[PDB]
Structure formats: C-alpha cells, structure tokens
Amino acid sequence: YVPEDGLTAQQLFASADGLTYNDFLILPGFIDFIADEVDLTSALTRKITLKTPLISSPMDTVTEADMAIAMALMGGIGF
Amino acid sequence: GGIQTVGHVVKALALGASTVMMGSLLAATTEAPGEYFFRGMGSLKIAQGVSGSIQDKGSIQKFVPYLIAGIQHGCQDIGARSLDVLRSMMYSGELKFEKRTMSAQIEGGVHGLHSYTFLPFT
Amino acid sequence: YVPEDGLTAQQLFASADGLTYNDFLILPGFIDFIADEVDLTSALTRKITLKTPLISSPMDTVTEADMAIAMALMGGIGFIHHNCTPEFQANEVRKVKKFEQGFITDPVVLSPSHTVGDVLEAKMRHGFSGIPITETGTMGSKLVGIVTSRDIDFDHTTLLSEVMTPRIELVVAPAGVTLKEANEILQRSKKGKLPIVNDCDELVAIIARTDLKKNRDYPLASKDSQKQLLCGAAVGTREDDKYRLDLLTQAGVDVIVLDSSQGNSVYQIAMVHYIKQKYPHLQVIGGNVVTAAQAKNLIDAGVDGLRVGMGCGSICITQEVMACGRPQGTAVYKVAEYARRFGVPIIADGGIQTVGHVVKALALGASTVMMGSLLAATTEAPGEYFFRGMGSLKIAQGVSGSIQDKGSIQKFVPYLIAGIQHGCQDIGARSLDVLRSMMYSGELKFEKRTMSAQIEGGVHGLHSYTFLPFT
Amino acid sequence: YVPEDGLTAQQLFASADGLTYNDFLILPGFIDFIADEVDLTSALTRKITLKTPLISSPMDTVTEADMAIAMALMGGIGF
Ligand SMILES: NC(=O)c1ccc[n+]([C@@H]2O[C@H](COP(=O)([O-])OP(=O)(O)OC[C@H]3O[C@@H](n4cnc5c(N)ncnc54)[C@H](O)[C@@H]3O)[C@@H](O)[C@H]2O)c1
Ligand SMILES: Nc1nc2c(ncn2[C@@H]2O[C@H](COP(=O)(O)OP(=O)(O)OP(=O)(O)O)[C@@H](O)[C@H]2O)c(=O)[nH]1
Ligand SMILES: Nc1nc2c(ncn2[C@@H]2O[C@H](COP(=O)(O)OP(=O)(O)OP(=O)(O)O)[C@@H](O)[C@H]2O)c(=O)[nH]1
Ligand SMILES: Nc1ncnc2c1ncn2[C@@H]1O[C@H](COP(=O)(O)OP(=O)(O)OP(=O)(O)O)[C@@H](O)[C@H]1O
Ligand SMILES: O=c1[nH]cnc2c1ncn2[C@@H]1O[C@H](COP(=O)(O)O)[C@@H](O)[C@H]1O
Ligand SMILES: O=c1[nH]cnc2c1ncn2[C@@H]1O[C@H](COP(=O)(O)O)[C@@H](O)[C@H]1O
C-alpha cells in the first residue's frame, strides 16, 4: 500500500482561484509502452475525426490556402 | 475504562493500545468477589466512585472464549492477520475510519422492535 | 433571477461526516403533473426490470413462499431465505413459480381407471381440481376427458369414466397455436379449461381461465417470458451451497443473491465464478458492500447486481459485536455513484423505516430498496401472532423482536407505492430515473437536518395521538 | 483504479473534537483467511507477552485470587 499524492482535477479546480496552464502540473505514472505507440486520434466535431489535435486559428496572418493545405497534409485542419 | 463491548475492545486495539483492561465487563461473574442478590475503589474524604450492580454472567472460563472469538471475527472482517498487523495498518494509513454521528449511532439495536432478547453464545 | 439554495448531493457528502437517512432533506421543486403519472419502473439486475422498487429481504421471519407470491403479484420481488433444508427451499420456489403459469406444461393427470377418491385426494394434496384424463394417465396419450370440481359436487369408489365430460363434448384447440389464439378460442368457449392436443390427439399442455383472470386483476405483476411469477432465492457460500443451488435451479429460480455479512471475500468471489460457469443464464447479486474498493472486485467477478449496507439493520447488532460498518446514506451514495459506470444496479438494504427513507434511498442512486422489519409482521409473513435476525441464534449477530401486525401485503403495498409517488411528485420528478439523473446533474439539492430540526416531525406538543395510515 | 474512501486515523483525530469509541467506525477490507487463524499475541510490558490482550482491572469487586487464576489460565493476566 502506498498513499495517494496530489489533487484530482475536480479538487484542483474547486477552489475557484483562476488557474491557467502555467499554474499547475500533472504528476507522472507508469510507462509500459514505446512513445510512438501513443494514438492521438481526436474529434473535431461530431462527424469529423482528426488523426492529430492540431488546428490553426483563423486569422489574416495565418491560415492561407497554402497553410491549410500544408496542415491538412499533416493530419490537422486549418480554418 | 470505557470498554463495554467487543467493538470497543477491537477499537481500542486498533488505535495503538497493546492491551485492554476491563472493569464492569467482568464485575459480575462466578469468579468475581462477593455474593449475589435476587463498587468503584474510590467510592467510599470525597467520593471518587459509585456502588453498582450487574446481571451476573456465568464463569470466565466459559465467557472469555466468546470474547476472544468476537475479537478474531472483528479483525477478520477487516483483513488483519494479527493485532500487530492491524496496528501497523493503522500507522501506515491503510486502515481508514469513518465518523458516526448520532443518527448513525442509533442504527445499532434500532428501536424498530417492541421487545427482544440477546442470548450471546458466551 | 433567483439565487440557488441548498447543497447538491456531492457537496453534502463531501464533508465525510457519516450521514444517514434521518440526517438530511430534499428541497422541493415544481409540480406540473398528477401524482399517479409518476413511473417507478426500477432495475433489479442487468436483465430484470421491476415495475416497483420494493424487495423483501431474505430472512426466516419474512419471505415465505406465500409472501414471495404476494409481493411478486404487486410488482416487486421476494427472496426466499436459505435457513432451511435445500428440499424445503426448492419446494418454496416451486410454489412461487406455480401460482400463475400461462401454458401449464406439467399438469398432473390421471387415467380413467382412477377413482373420485383419487381426484379428491389430489385436490387436497395440491389445490388444482381440473384433473385432465388420458388413456395411460400421463401426458403422452390420447385425451379422453377432464374432471373438475363442478363434476364432484356430491360413492368415492366410482371410476372417473362415470364422471368425466367425454372428448366427444370437449371444445379443444389444436396444438402449435400461439398463446393469443389459444386465449381467443378459450374465451369464445365460455368454459373454464382448454386442454391443448396436437394433430395426433395427444395432450401437450393446458391453460386456465383463472390465469388470465389473475392477469386482469393484477396489472403490475412481475413475470418472465412464460407468464409465470418471477422468483428469487438466497444462498450462502459454503460447499453445500453447490447442491443447494443445483436444487434451486431445478426448481426454476430466476435470480440468486449471495448472503454474507461482508461480501468482499475470496469465498464469495469463488461462488460468483462457479455460478457464472455452471449457470451462465442465472443472474447473481453480489454480497454486502459499503465501499468502492469492495464493489470493484465483486464487479470484476461479474455480479449482475449489488447489495449495499452493513451494520444498519433494525435487527442487526453487528456494529456492536464488531467495530466495522458505515452509515447507510453515505454507503448507498458512494457505492451507487461508482457502480453506475458499469450498469450494475444497487439494492440499498437496511435502515428503511418509512416512505421518506425509501424515497431518500432511491434519490441517492439505489435502483431498488430491500425491506426487513417494515414487512416482518403481515398476514403473509411466516409464523403466528401473540396477544428474528437470521444470525440471531457461535456468536449472536442478531436479535429476536416483535412487531404490531400490519394486515396484508396486497392492501399494504399500494399505500407504500402512493407514498413514493407523492414524494417524487412534490419534488418534480416524472420518474425514478429522472430523479436520479437530477441528483447526478446537480439539479436536486439537499439540506442538512440537525437534531433540533429532526425533533420537528411528530413534535411532542400533543398529549396522546393515533396515526391511522390508510395503508 | 478505485478511489480511496474514509479518513485515516491521523486525519480523524486531527480535528481535535474529542472522539470516543462510540463516535467512529472502521471500514472493512479483504478477507482471505479463516477467523481462527488470527493471532492475538500482545505485549503487556517490555518483557511480558500475553497470548490475549485481555486484562482485569485491579478493584475490590473484581480480581480476587480465584479470578486472577481463572484469567491467567485463559491467556490474560489479572491485577
Ligand atoms: N447487516 C449486515 O451487514 C450483516 C451483518 C452480520 C450478519 N448478517 C447476516 O447474517 C447472516 C450470516 O452472516 P455471516 O457473516 O455469519 O455469514 P457466513 O457465515 O455465511 O459468512 C461469514 C463467515 O463465513 C466464512 N466462510 C464463508 N465461506 C467460507 C468457506 N468457503 N470456507 C471457510 N469459511 C468460509 C467467512 O470466512 C466468515 O468467517 C446473513 O443473513 C447475513 O446477511 C448481516
Ligand atoms: N394464460 C395466460 N395468459 C397470460 C398470462 N399473462 C398474460 N397473458 C396473456 O398474454 C398477453 C399479455 O398482454 P397484455 O395482457 O396486453 O399485457 P399485460 O397484462 O401487461 O401482460 P404481462 O406483461 O404478462 O403482464 C395477453 O394475451 C394476456 O391475456 C398468464 O399468466 N396466463
Ligand atoms: N377458482 C378455481 N380455480 C381452479 C379450479 N381448478 C383449478 N383451479 C386453478 O387453476 C390454477 C392454474 O394455475 P396452476 O396452479 O399453475 O395450475 P396447475 O399447475 O395445473 O396445478 P397446481 O400447482 O396443482 O395448482 C390453479 O392455481 C388452481 O387454483 C377450480 O375449480 N376453481
Ligand atoms: N375444454 C372443455 N370443454 C368442455 N367442457 C369442459 C372443458 N374443460 C372443462 N370442462 C367441463 O366444464 C365444466 C365446468 O368447467 P370449469 O373449468 O368451469 O369448472 P371449474 O372451474 O373447475 O369449477 P368452479 O366452478 O369450482 O370454478 C365441467 O363439467 C368440466 O368438466
Ligand atoms: O473508584 C474509582 N473511581 C474512579 N475510577 C476508578 C475507580 N476504580 C476503578 N476505576 C477505574 O475505572 C475503570 C473501570 O471502568 P470500566 O472499564 O468501565 O468498568 C478502570 O480503568 C479503573 O482503574
Ligand atoms: O441476523 C442478522 N444479523 C445482522 N443483519 C441481518 C440479519 N438478518 C438480516 N440482516 C440484514 O438486516 C436487514 C433488515 O433490516 P431492516 O430493513 O431495518 O428490518 C437486511 O438488510 C438484512 O440482510
């Protein structure tokens, strides 16, 4: 038996202090697989599944046609 | 002091007490001093005790085996192979407690019945 | 805009203080429906759905055959206690299953050479009086006639051939016809019995007017695909329980519950594995668990249901004989919030004293509620009156009590249903499933009830009084 | 994975509210042994080990010679 350490997400966010990404960490676990085996298939909407989570934001300094092509080729999607 | 039942004996053994010393639980028995009908040692300059009476409970040689079996079953229901393992479990944090408010205390011999008898095998 | 009041279930139970049913309340909501509209269809195990959540606990002072019948008729289910000979338990389950039948596939029959005394003897022995008659005195023979009570309203030495209604007169339906058409020809016939014979004129099975009359009378009964009452039985975890279970399944049990003070043990898990190997079609309900850790390994073993609660029974002295236990409200909440992910329903047993406790238990995630003392003194309960925990006697786990008698189940349970319906209607839940979804999403909110708020039930402002529930 | 339930002894007694035996419970665990297998050997003092924890209190209404004998015979000790 080994005691549990750290806060669940629910416990962490219950305090209502306004956390951001730079304000908490995830404690490690157990490794029994090569890194490349991880699968990133993610769902964009309820009928589109992307093989990677990456998306490019719709802005006039990013996501041209030539970037939407080059980001759809790599598994993501561009707006 | 305070030991009234096997539950209290095991609770005291769980909290770190190596042994448990009994008073009233053994006061009325075939081996206890005096005689029957049908006392705190400071009970009499000031009264530290009281003079009581108890229902008689047979003999120690027939009553203590029940008190041992109750302890064994109480630890077996917890998963401790011995008292030392039970106290080690309490110390390491493996054995966990729950608080018992009054409305959870009344859930022992609940008063749903009109009358009853106990008959412990003793 | 109106501010939110009260604590969600999660907020109420996060403090970890050990709440019970008498230690909190549910704040009301909005009413836009008549009480009778509420729907109580509850799930016993993963393949049994009961039209009411009431269960009778397996004990030697409750759940006879005559109470399992009278509680299955009213929509619930009853578990036959296992403090009896295995043949006795099998007989109890047989009598539970042979109350209403549909196709009576094993009717007792006689040959024409028998005697009116024999027919009367069989009547006194079982209860059925419409004895079919076949040439060989068995199912595999020509149907020659039938003898019923109306034929014997009287001499006892006369043979059945002199009292039978012959086959030339009988109105019979050809075998292989669906149940509906069989009932149609029975009802146009205006006669009590409709034997069923095949194209070879050989008796196959019979149906009775009284079975469909019982269906008409009891709309909420619980039945299987053969239209015969649903029965459950309890069994221990010793070795002899294997032969016990063999006998039980011979009787025709539908659901079996493992009986143990603490469920989480290698012996219970071995029984679960044996059951799910020998009888894959039988639903097994796990033992008494009060924690997620206890529930997990029973779920893995493959219990189709879970019994939650330990130490809180009315007749239970476990909390005093040993130090283990957990308050009923916290126990039911915290094993029913975990079980829900795997679909195994929960049966919160013990501590139920009132309709308020029944509804409180069903609000906290318990799919069904199992009752003890509430049903112990009734016309259908075992024993006799004047004017007992199953471990009450090496050590006393129970107590022998007495209760004030409460009439019959068939007149007591409708009030118990109406109370639940009104309690949910006052909250605004169209059904128990909606109530538990409300509890889970956070819409249904609770309030704590200190002692000075508990004393505000039947307050002691009165000198004396009477209750008179319509029952 | 299954979440932990209940309070450790340290957590239970940290509040400093004055608990007694009738004020808390012990949650159950796992059973893989017959009850009789449990061993109760307990230590009275640093050089006396009793095969059972039971002791009889020293009082004038208990622990005669005839009870000290009958309690030492059963594994305990009497004062
Ligand atoms: N409210 C409660 O939680 C509660 C508490 C105590 C008793 N009860 C009731 O009392 C009745 C019996 O309780 P019980 O605890 O005596 O049940 P039980 O005797 O069937 O099981 C308890 C004991 O049986 C032993 N056991 C089980 N299978 C075994 C096997 N194969 N080999 C060896 N030992 C084995 C266990 O180790 C344990 O000591 C039941 O009706 C039960 O529900 C209920
Ligand atoms: N002979 C016989 N027929 C039955 C029995 N129970 C139901 N039936 C028939 O099976 C059909 C059941 O459909 P309904 O009567 O519409 O519905 P119900 O009463 O809810 O039926 P259950 O779901 O069995 O309660 C009808 O034809 C009934 O007459 C029974 O015990 N015996
Ligand atoms: N009212 C009434 N019911 C009858 C009569 N004869 C038989 N029955 C009922 O027919 C019903 C049919 O259901 P079952 O009990 O399953 O019938 P069975 O399986 O043939 O026989 P038993 O188990 O012996 O009762 C029985 O419950 C009997 O009570 C009779 O003369 N009058
Ligand atoms: N299929 C059938 N066709 C014709 N007559 C039948 C048939 N089955 C039974 N009978 C006869 O009809 C008469 C009454 O049958 P029924 O089944 O209504 O009696 P019962 O229900 O046993 O009597 P009770 O009036 O006590 O309820 C008897 O003479 C019986 O033998
Ligand atoms: O006279 C007395 N006054 C106060 N405490 C006493 C007296 N005599 C014995 N005790 C203590 O009280 C205990 C008995 O309590 P019991 O276990 O509940 O019966 C023992 O722990 C004693 O040492
Ligand atoms: O003999 C016993 N000792 C301890 N608990 C029992 C015993 N018999 C039945 N029980 C349980 O106690 C309950 C009955 O409590 P009630 O609902 O308050 O009457 C059911 O949940 C049972 O399974």
UniProtKB/Swiss-Prot annotation, chain B:
IMP binds at residues 1-2, 23-24, 39-42, 48. IMP type I is the main species in normal leukocytes and type II predominates over type I in the tumor. Induction: Constitutively expressed. K(+) binds at residues 107-109. It is found in: Cytoplasm; Nucleus. Transmembrane segments: none annotated. Catalyzes the conversion of inosine 5'-phosphate (IMP) to xanthosine 5'-phosphate (XMP), the first committed and rate-limiting step in the de novo synthesis of guanine nucleotides, and therefore plays an important role in the regulation of cell growth. Could also have a single-stranded nucleic acid-binding activity and could play a role in RNA and/or DNA metabolism. It may also have a role in the development of malignancy and the growth progression of some tumors. Belongs to the IMPDH/GMPR family. Homotetramer. Because IMPDH activity is tightly linked with cell proliferation, it has been recognized as a target for cancer and viral chemotherapy and as a target for immunosuppressive drugs. The activities of the antitumor drug tiazofurin, the antiviral drug ribavirin, and the immunosuppressive drugs mizoribine and mycophenolic acid (MPA) are attributed to the inhibition of IMPDH. In addition, bacterial and parasitic IMPDH's differ significantly from mammalian enzymes, which makes it a suitable target for anti-infective drugs. It is linked to Retinitis pigmentosa 10: A retinal dystrophy belonging to the group of pigmentary retinopathies. Retinitis pigmentosa is characterized by retinal pigment deposits visible on fundus examination and primary loss of rod photoreceptor cells followed by secondary loss of cone photoreceptors. Patients typically have night vision blindness and loss of midperipheral visual field. As their condition progresses, they lose their far peripheral visual field and eventually central vision as well. Leber congenital amaurosis 11: A severe dystrophy of the retina, typically becoming evident in the first years of life. Visual function is usually poor and often accompanied by nystagmus, sluggish or near-absent pupillary responses, photophobia, high hyperopia and keratoconus. This is Inosine-5'-monophosphate dehydrogenase 1. It comes from Homo sapiens (Human). The gene is IMPDH1. The chain holds residues 365 to 509 of 514 of the full protein.
